[PDB]
């Protein structure tokens, strides 16, 4: 479902970036949460073909 995940991605983008600078804690948490569920990346970044 490509038209759905864009809203959650933009909410996360708002959560991570503030006033032109990044907040380290939120960025680290988001990256660590994302890497453990690879299916969030869509078919392109799948390792299995």
């Amino acid at each position: 479902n490509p038209c759905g995940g864009e809203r959650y991605l933009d909410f996360l983008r708002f959560a991570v970036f503030v006033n032109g600078e990044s907040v380290e804690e939120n960025a680290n948490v988001v990256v660590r949460l994302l890497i453990r569920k690879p299916e969030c990346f869509g078919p392109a970044l799948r390792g299995e073909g």
Binding site: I35, R36, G47, E48
Partner: protein, 220 residues
């Protein structure tokens, strides 16, 4: 004996399923001439004995995270959430996470091997409990299941079967490991299993041997 302790000989084990059959595998390595670790089957011990000589590891040290960090910035019982160091019994090297990666299906995976020096942070591993029945600071008991995390690469020990062969690596998928001790402090001057020794006949004037290498009896 119920609680694990340092300076004890222990074996790292795991369980898997193939063709509806359950297999128990032990982590092993050679050291001299080969650094990469692999898996030795142990389910069929009643017919084909396994090679336990290269599977034994020794718990060298256990420390807290803050103490380890401060030290790098320069018979205790072990707790959950502590960092431990393991030494190979035979080669004397230390288990560690390598920078090379032989994998082709996982891009973030790393290989695990042996290291000749205890220097660096790559040799330390942190332990975590399997479920909520155990506390963060609780003591570790025999028969439990643990999760191991590298303090340098921040990855779990993963069992890989993508290529059809059962392999070990470091990745972001967790797997349960059973820490089974095999030996502790024994009494001095008393014989124990798993040792190397000589058998003497009579007044030490004879011993039990086989033919030399070039003998025509096929050395049997």
């Amino acid at each position: 004996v119920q609680f694990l302790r340092t300076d004890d000989e222990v074996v790292l084990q795991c369980n898997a399923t193939v063709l509806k059959e359950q297999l128990k595998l032990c982590l092993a390595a050679e050291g001299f001439g080969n650094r990469l670790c692999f898996l030795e089957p142990t389910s069929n011990a009643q017919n084909v004995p396994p090679d336990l000589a290269i599977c034994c590891f020794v718990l060298e040290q256990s420390l807290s995270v803050r103490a380890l960090q401060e030290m790098l910035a320069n018979h205790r019982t072990l707790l959950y959430g502590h960092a431990i160091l393991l030494r190979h019994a035979h080669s004397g090297m230390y288990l560690s996470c390598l920078t090379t990666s032989r994998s082709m299906t996982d891009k973030l995976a790393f290989d695990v091997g042996l290291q000749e020096d205890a220097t660096g942070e790559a040799c330390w591993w942190t332990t975590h409990p399997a479920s909520k029945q155990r506390s963060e600071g609780e003591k570790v008991r025999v028969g439990d299941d643990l999760i191991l995390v590298s303090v340098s690469s921040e990855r779990y020990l993963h069992l890989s079967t993508a290529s059809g062969e059962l392999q070990v690596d470091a990745s972001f998928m967790q797997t349960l490991w059973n820490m089974n001790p095999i030996c502790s402090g024994c009494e001095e001057g008393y014989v124990t299993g798993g040792h190397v020794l000589r058998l003497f006949h009579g007044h030490m004037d004879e011993c039990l041997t086989i033919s030399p290498a070039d003998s025509d009896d096929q050395r049997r």
